[PDB]
Amino acid sequence: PMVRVATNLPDKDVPANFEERLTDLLAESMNKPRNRIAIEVLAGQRITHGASRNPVAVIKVESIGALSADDNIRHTQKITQFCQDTLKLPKDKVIITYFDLQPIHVGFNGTTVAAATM
Template sequence: MNVVVKPGLPVLIAGSCAPCVLLSVSAIAVTDTAEKNKEHSAKIFRFLTQELELPEDRIVIRFYPLEPWQVGKKGTVMTFL
């Protein structure tokens, strides 16, 4: 998992610039169905609302399914690893 945090950016969600989280999740064979993402979303929301004390309406998650050939690693792509 890779995490990039960019604090202090001005973001407008639902007409408010209150603190928020915009999270992008991309993975191979983990984010490829609505059922899987519903489970991931529930767990991520639970964690973020508890740890950051943010209301759910201040969190947005975007899921990006990836194919193994779309991810490079060790001088090749995941298809061949």
């Protein structure tokens, strides 16, 4: 999985262990190995939501599978709770988009994922 978390909160408000903890959280929720998870954090960014500059997170989650409609209820519950706990954001200020990828559309270790599997 490839995750991007952007927030208008300043960088000082996104704890140093945010990425590590989110990695563990998503490994469990998505049934994915921790070593296959990348997390980008972009803090101190201009973001509005309904034209408001109040604290908000906008998140993208890409993965080959593990993103069924049922799965995504679980990931949204967990990611949202995680952001509430760590970033102190309200539930309605965590916006997540999921991208369900084909293995022919991911490059890693110098070739596509499809080319490295059965």
